[PDB]
Amino acid sequence: STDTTARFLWHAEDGDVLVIPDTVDPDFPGYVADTLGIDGTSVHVERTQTPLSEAVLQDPEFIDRLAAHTGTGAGWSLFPCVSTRAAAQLTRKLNVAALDGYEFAMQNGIDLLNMKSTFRRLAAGLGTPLTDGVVARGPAEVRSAIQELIAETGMVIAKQDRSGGGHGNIGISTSPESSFPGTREVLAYANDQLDTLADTLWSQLTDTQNQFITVETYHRADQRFFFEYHLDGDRARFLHSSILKYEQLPESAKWIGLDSPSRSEFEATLKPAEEFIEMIRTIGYRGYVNIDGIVLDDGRVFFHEINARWSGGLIYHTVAERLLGHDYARNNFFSSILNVVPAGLADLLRSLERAGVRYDKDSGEGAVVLGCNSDLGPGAELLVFSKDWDRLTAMKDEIATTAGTLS
Amino acid sequence: SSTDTTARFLWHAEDGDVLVIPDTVDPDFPGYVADTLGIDGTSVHVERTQTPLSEAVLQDPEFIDRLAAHTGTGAGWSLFPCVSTRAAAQLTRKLNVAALDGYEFAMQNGIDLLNMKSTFRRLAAGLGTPLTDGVVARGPAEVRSAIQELIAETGMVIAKQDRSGGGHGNIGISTSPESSFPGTREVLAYANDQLDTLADTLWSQLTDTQNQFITVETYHRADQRFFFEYHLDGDRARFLHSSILKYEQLPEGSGGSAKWIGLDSPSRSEFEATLKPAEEFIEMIRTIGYRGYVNIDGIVLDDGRVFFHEINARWSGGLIYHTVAERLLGHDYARNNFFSSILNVVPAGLADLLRSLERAGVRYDKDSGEGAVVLGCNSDLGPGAELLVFSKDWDRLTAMKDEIATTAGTLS
Numbered sequence: 001s002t003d004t005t006a007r008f009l010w011h012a013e014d015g016d017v018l019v020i021p022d023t024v025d026p027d028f029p030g031y032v033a034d035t036l037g038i039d040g041t042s043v044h045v046e047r048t049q050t051p052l053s054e055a056v057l058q059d060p061e062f063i064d065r066l067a068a069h070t071g072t073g074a075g076w077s078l079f080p081c082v083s084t085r086a087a088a089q090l091t092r093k094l095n096v097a098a099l100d101g102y103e104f105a106m107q108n109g110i111d112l113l114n115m116k117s118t119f120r121r122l123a124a125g126l127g128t129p130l131t132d133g134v135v136a137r138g139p140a141e142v143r144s145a146i147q148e149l150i151a152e153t154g155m156v157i158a159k160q161d162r163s164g165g166g167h168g169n170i171g172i173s174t175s176p177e178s179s180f181p182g183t184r185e186v187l188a189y190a191n192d193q194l195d196t197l198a199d200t201l202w203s204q205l206t207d208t209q210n211q212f213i214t215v216e217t218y219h220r221a222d223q224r225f226f227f228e229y230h231l232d233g234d235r236a237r238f239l240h241s242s243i244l245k246y247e248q249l250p251e252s253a254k255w256i257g258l259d260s261p262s263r264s265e266f267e268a269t270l271k272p273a274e275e276f277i278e279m280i281r282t283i284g285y286r287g288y289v290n291i292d293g294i295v296l297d298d299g300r301v302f303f304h305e306i307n308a309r310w311s312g313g314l315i316y317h318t319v320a321e322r323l324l325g326h327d328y329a330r331n332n333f334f335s336s337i338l339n340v341v342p343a344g345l346a347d348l349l350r351s352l353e354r355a356g357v358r359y360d361k362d363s364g365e366g367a368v369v370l371g372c373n374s375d376l377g378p379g380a381e382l383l384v385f386s387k388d389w390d391r392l393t394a395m396k397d398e399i400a401t402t403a404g405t406l407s
Numbered sequence: 408s409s410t411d412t413t414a415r416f417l418w419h420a421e422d423g424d425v426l427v428i429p430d431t432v433d434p435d436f437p438g439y440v441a442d443t444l445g446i447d448g449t450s451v452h453v454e455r456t457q458t459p460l461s462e463a464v465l466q467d468p469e470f471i472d473r474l475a476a477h478t479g480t481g482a483g484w485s486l487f488p489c490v491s492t493r494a495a496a497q498l499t500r501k502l503n504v505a506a507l508d509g510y511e512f513a514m515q516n517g518i519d520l521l522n523m524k525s526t527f528r529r530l531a532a533g534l535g536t537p538l539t540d541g542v543v544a545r546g547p548a549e550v551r552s553a554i555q556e557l558i559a560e561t562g563m564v565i566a567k568q569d570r571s572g573g574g575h576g577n578i579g580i581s582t583s584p585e586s587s588f589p590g591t592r593e594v595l596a597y598a599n600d601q602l603d604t605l606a607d608t609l610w611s612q613l614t615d616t617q618n619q620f621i622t623v624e625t626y627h628r629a630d631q632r633f634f635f636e637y638h639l640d641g642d643r644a645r646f647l648h649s650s651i652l653k654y655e656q657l658p659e660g661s662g663g664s665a666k667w668i669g670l671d672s673p674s675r676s677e678f679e680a681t682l683k684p685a686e687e688f689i690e691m692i693r694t695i696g697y698r699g700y701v702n703i704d705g706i707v708l709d710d711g712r713v714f715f716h717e718i719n720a721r722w723s724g725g726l727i728y729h730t731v732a733e734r735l736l737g738h739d740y741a742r743n744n745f746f747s748s749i750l751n752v753v754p755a756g757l758a759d760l761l762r763s764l765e766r767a768g769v770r771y772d773k774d775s776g777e778g779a780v781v782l783g784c785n786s787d788l789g790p791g792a793e794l795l796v797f798s799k800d801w802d803r804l805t806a807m808k809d810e811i812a813t814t815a816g817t818l819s
């Protein structure tokens with residue numbers, strides 16, 4: 001059915017392999033490879049019918065599947081989303097390019113990072129800015145932390161320690177007309193019931209491996225942004241910045257898309273995030289990492305986490321650079337729609353044509369398909385380009401009109 | 408009415424200080440220390456708590472008030488905590504005492520993220536710090552394949568609790584009895600046909616709710632078992648001392664574990680391959696932001712290889728040794744001096760213990776800066792009473808030691 005993984009096909013060059021647990025719209029590779037201007041027939045897709053997990057990566061059936069392509073391993077490398085211990089061993093076993101930071105990974109190092117607990121710890125000691133927070137160690141400590149952090153704003157967040165996308169986050173409100181981007185539920189504050197309120201907070205966001213909870217002052221932000229980086233033994237190249245776009249608030253806020261150069265890239269954001277990033281470079285992580293953060297109306301800057309993995313808009317950025325150019329951000333803007341009424345790639349391309357906004361190499365304007373049927377923003381996932389923000393906004397509203405969204 | 412293991416830290420005391428102990432001090436022991444030290448004894452007080460120094464007590468309103476009574480308005484005062492927990496940092500605030508350096512780091516129990524064995528394997532492996540082959544084991548099957556792969560090189564694997572200390576969480580695995588395992592509690596023979604339950608025996612006993620990691624490593628025989636202690640501030644990571652870790656000598660018996668019995672300081676393990684890597688590792692943890700005392704353990708191989716085992720963001724053991732050394736012989740004491748502790752003297756009343764040294768001819772002579780001093784009269788630090796011996800000469804100091812063992816007996 002779904003093709004939420006097909007999107008990573010845009011990372012592809014001649015000779016490459018993609019691995020998906022999903023399906024591909026039969027047309028989606030040729031289309032992607034025609035757009036990317038590469039030899040479709042020189043590009044492979046190896047499907048599993050079960051999720052892409054550690055067990056798979058260790059599984060030699062799985063392993064020899066890849067060894068068919070890599071054969072000797074010479075001139076082959078692995079391009080993992082999460083530089084896991086199995087992923088390193090997979091480079092070991094295939095005789096493939098050694099993973100960078102191999103040893104950090106072999107000690108499951110990339111899993112200390114990708115904890116919200118580790119983040120605050122690291123950012124307190126370093127001085128990187130943080131909302132007032134507590135790394136909760138149990139329901140008792142969860143109860144106190146809300147009794148204090150509720151007061152500045154009337155708003156508080158509770159994050160499961162290992163999690164992504166805003167999925168392990170519950171908010172705490174003193175006002176039903178407060179909206180919480182990056183939460184799942186939102187529960188109302190209640191002085192007379194907080195022992196019970198931290199209970200439901202404990203049981204829902206802790207398990208056997210995760211016994212730390214974070215609880216922060218939630219702040220209403222004027223800019224919800226993040227920065228994605230690439231790391232090696234020499235440097236951390238700043239890759240890009242984007243905007244976490246939310247909605248579901250009419251008078252809780254679900255994620256809906258990403259937007260191109262963030263309107264948030266000054267020193268007070270770049271410099272503290274860059275310093276933190278390098279310290280992580282120092283402790284060993286080799287690869288892509290991104291740092292979430294906000295900017296407030298008054299001006300205070302805050303950071304939430306690093307995820308040592310593909311930001312999830314890395315694909316957006318790759319696409320832009322492969323279509324528009326290394327420096328694309330200077331004169332271009334991209335933006336992403338989800339919940340587009342899904343359909344065949346053919347039926348998708350026609351509405352984009354019927355709307356007048358299909359990607360068009362001449363202008364550098366228009367939209368491309370990253371999935372006809374995905375779960376991430378359940379719908380078809382599009383990416384749209386424009387030298388002009390206002391044009392981009394019209395083009396999207398057309399794709400609404402012509403192709404159809406779901407509410 | 409029991410152990411005085413806490414009483415050793417009276418030797419940090421200066422004028423007007425307060426030491427907090429859950430313990431029992433020989434009622435003569437304070438005055439002996441201040442005396443030997445030269446402090447105004449009636450200035451230093453000792454506040455006995457009837458419970459361990461738990462986070463709840465640091466937060467106990469009566470405990471803090473009883474601390475306020477001495478701290479006054481905080482002005483002049485600082486906290487001198489072994490472990491900069493969160494409750495520690497919060498104490499300095501409600502007593503108006505000077506802020507704990509690294510406050511925010513502490514406020515996030517950073518200290519606790521450090522101090523995990525798994526953490527150390529991770530950071531060092533990322534940094535480059537020499538490690539022994541090993542694995543952060545997420546479960547018992549992992550433990551199985553680790554013991555299976557890691558047993559060969561030396562025939563000895565070690566297995567440790569993620570958050571523990573004093574060699575209490577380390578379980579040895581041996582393919583031969585006649586294995587000496589410094590830094591472990593028990594040693595188990597590795598059979599092939601019982602590597603199954605081996606692995607789940609270790610898993611079940613070295614984990615709990617809050618710990619789902621077990622460290623598994625190649626255990627090496629070693630020319631020297633050392634560590635280096637540092638002090639940390641915003642400006643500099645500060646080298647304090649190096650020290651030799653002394654473990655029990657087993658009569659080549661089918662027992663494996665060698666208990667820890669003492670500490671020799673001006674160590675013979677300070678060169679390029681131990682210092683500089685350790686240096687690099689310690690600076691980064693200053694980058695991440697720990698503030699205070701920390702130490703890094705390590706071994707040097709018969710063939711000259713080096714490996715580091717862990718850091719502890721807290722007082723090492725030998726910090727009181729080093730301290731007292733500084734206070735009695737001076738800052739740059741390691742140039743011309745040596746010291747060595749003892750853990751297993753027959754415990755005794757202070758007067759008697761002081762008789763023995765005199766009888767042995769080695770009670771610390773202020774005039775010559777030579778001889779021994781009591782650190783506790785009945786401590787459970789390993790064995791029993793703890794003493795610390797000084798000399799400008801290595802052989803003389805040893806000769807003083809067995810004099811003491813002859814004179815005051817030992818619990819071996």
Ligand SMILES: Nc1ncnc2c1ncn2[C@@H]1O[C@H](COP(=O)(O)OP(=O)(O)NP(=O)(O)O)[C@@H](O)[C@H]1O
Nearest residue numbers: 416423424425426427460483484485486487488489
């Ligand atoms: N776990 C511990 N065991 C024993 N003593 C401890 C422990 N943790 C802290 N202490 C003692 O607690 C005291 C902390 O010092 P504190 O109570 O703040 O006043 P002070 O520093 O001694 N006096 P001053 O700094 O000169 O004004 C020191 O005596 C430490 O030795």
Ligand SMILES: Nc1ncnc2c1ncn2[C@@H]1O[C@H](COP(=O)(O)OP(=O)(O)NP(=O)(O)O)[C@@H](O)[C@H]1O
Nearest residue numbers: 571572573574589590624625626627632704716717
């Ligand atoms: N893999 C190993 N190979 C060889 N010797 C080891 C190994 N691991 C530990 N040791 C030795 O055993 C001791 C055990 O201490 P360690 O492994 O650092 O944990 P620990 O008990 O927490 N140390 P500490 O808290 O300072 O008492 C070390 O000081 C070394 O002497």
Ligand SMILES: Nc1ncnc2c1ncn2[C@@H]1O[C@H](COP(=O)(O)O)[C@@H](O)[C@H]1O
Nearest residue numbers: 005008019052053080081082083084087
């Ligand atoms: N833990 C994971 N989370 C998300 N995607 C994953 C994960 N593991 C594997 N994948 C998929 O497998 C590829 C990268 O593998 P990995 O490095 O294990 O994330 C991408 O196609 C991902 O969609």
